[PDB]
Amino acid sequence: SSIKVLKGLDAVRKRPGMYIGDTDDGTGLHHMVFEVVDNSIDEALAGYCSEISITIHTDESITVRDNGRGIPVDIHKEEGVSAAEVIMTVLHAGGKFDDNTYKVSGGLHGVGVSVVNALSHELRLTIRRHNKVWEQVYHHGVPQFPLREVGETDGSGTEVHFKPSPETFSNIHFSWDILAKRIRELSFLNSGVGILLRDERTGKEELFKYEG
Ligand SMILES: CO[C@@H]1[C@@H](OC(N)=O)[C@@H](O)[C@H](Oc2ccc3c(O)c(NC(=O)c4ccc(O)c(CC=C(C)C)c4)c(=O)oc3c2C)OC1(C)C
């Protein structure tokens, strides 16, 4: 089972353009952010998330944080690992790739966040759920340790800090303009959700919240 999962992540790293799009022209790089944000938006659509933040760090890493339920943490009998680890490591975890419905939400969201994990040289997942803080670190999608309880919290939600792999992507430089344009659109499409974009490289920040 563990070998099968590692092979799946290796397949993403072998042919990244088939999962994320062009790895040189910035389209795949920005898709990495948009896939993580789309998971937070799904939590807003479900009725649990009102706040999403996207932070661009000085090392061109990204943090996406939401105040949703937090990815479930309970250990599966079958995989022997947290539900969260399965979500972060298995393409379309728990289900099929929907060849009928990918045209609406995109193929990338159809395979899911495990692609972002596979194509990140490092990813830190922090979950706030049931008053506990859980963390898991990955490298190229491979967990460093099982999801572990690291603290207590009054908050809930999911935080993903990822560093795109320079083995996958050339010209790893995020565009404020590309991110802001899409975030403004997501705000318009998702009334009441506050989407905060912060660029620590420049000190630029902008809250997008549509009240229509
Ligand atoms: C990347 O994870 C995404 C989530 O992303 C974010 N940012 O929250 C979100 O888009 C959505 O999150 C869901 C989707 C479904 C449930 C959901 O059905 C829940 N209900 C439960 O009672 C529950 C409790 C334990 C448990 O193991 C599961 C199934 C586990 C799943 C679906 C990962 C569900 C729940 O607590 O949280 C859920 C959450 C947080 O789907 C994921 C997990 C693929």
Author numbering: 10 to 221
From the paper:
Bacterial DNA gyrase and DNA topoisomerase IV (topo IV), both type II topoisomerases, responsible for the ATP-driven introduction of negative supercoils into DNA and ATP-driven supercoil relaxation and decatenation, respectively, are validated antibacterial targets. Gyrase is a heterotetramer of GyrA and GyrB subunits (A2B2), while topo IV is a heterotetramer of ParC and ParE subunits (C2E2). We have developed compounds with a promising activity against Acinetobacter baumannii and Pseudomonas aeruginosa, which are both on the WHO priority list of antibiotic-resistant bacteria. Cocrystal structures of 1 in complex with Escherichia coli GyrB24 and (S)-27 in complex with A. baumannii GyrB23 and P. aeruginosa GyrB24 revealed their binding to the ATP-binding pocket of the GyrB subunit.
Whereas fluoroquinolones, which target both gyrase and topo IV, are widely used in the clinic, inhibitors interfering with ATP binding to GyrB/ParE subunits have not found significant clinical application, despite intensive research efforts during the last 70 years since the discovery of novobiocin, the first ATP-competitive GyrB inhibitor.
